[PDB]
């Protein structure tokens, strides 16, 4: 009854061979995933729930179909891959606090991240390739306190109780991203969460379009018509005139196959959310 297609995943992210389950490998897989499979919410934007977080489902979409996905799909996929390689992986859930006002109400658990034990290394590592444009680009120690360097900007974990907060030093300013606990979550709990993010009419991922990817030199983030690119020394902002140009970017810049949404009128839906 099947067997995990580890090679097909490695292929999708521009790698080959079979690596040791060690820290170097973890860094390499994260960087390759970052530049290869984009963040995207086309399914929930178009009314297609993200309901099934099985390995079969996630491989079918993100590996076999040249689609990206959102957090549950990204970290879901990478979690399966890492376990197959010999890492030990717990799935964690988190509340997003990025740019939220001070006494804003508690957010829902909408984010899934990984806590990974690496053979030959002490403690555990926070791995997150699913947060979008500002996602972690290296694994970091799941250790509260210290500023940690990454392929890009410094990040830091702090703890108040069992609640951990991840922050990024973004263009000089520390910005909280999300909070989480270290309680391992079963698949079904993640699936309830993904049902919510992918179908609730108030969800950021149902009300507009988000597409992102992160290379060695740049973070790319598209929300509606607005493309923001953060590079060393400069930021670029491209404001697309219409959905036609947005679709061209989806296909041509971000490499997403819209042929897989044939029959749904992607352009007409995109045309509705240019400014949301």
UniProtKB/Swiss-Prot annotation:
Q: A GO molecular function for this record?
A: arylamine N-acetyltransferase activity
The catalytic residues are: 71 (acyl-thioester intermediate), 111, 128
Q: List the EC numbers from the record.
A: 2.3.1.5
Name the domain of life. Answer: Bacteria
Q: Which SUPFAM superfamilies match?
A: Cysteine proteinases
**EC class name:** transferase
Question: What catalytic activity is recorded?
Answer: an arylamine + acetyl-CoA = an N-acetylarylamine + CoA
- Return the Pfam families for the record: Acetyltransf_2
Please describe what this protein does: Catalyzes the transfer of the acetyl group from acetyl coenzyme A to the free amino group of arylamines and hydrazines. Substrates include isoniazid, anisidine, and 4-aminoveratrole, and to a much lesser extent, p-aminobenzoic acid.
Quaternary structure and partners: Homodimer and homotetramer.
Could you identify this protein by its name?
Arylamine N-acetyltransferase
| Organism classification | Bacteria, Bacillati, Actinomycetota, Actinomycetes, Mycobacteriales
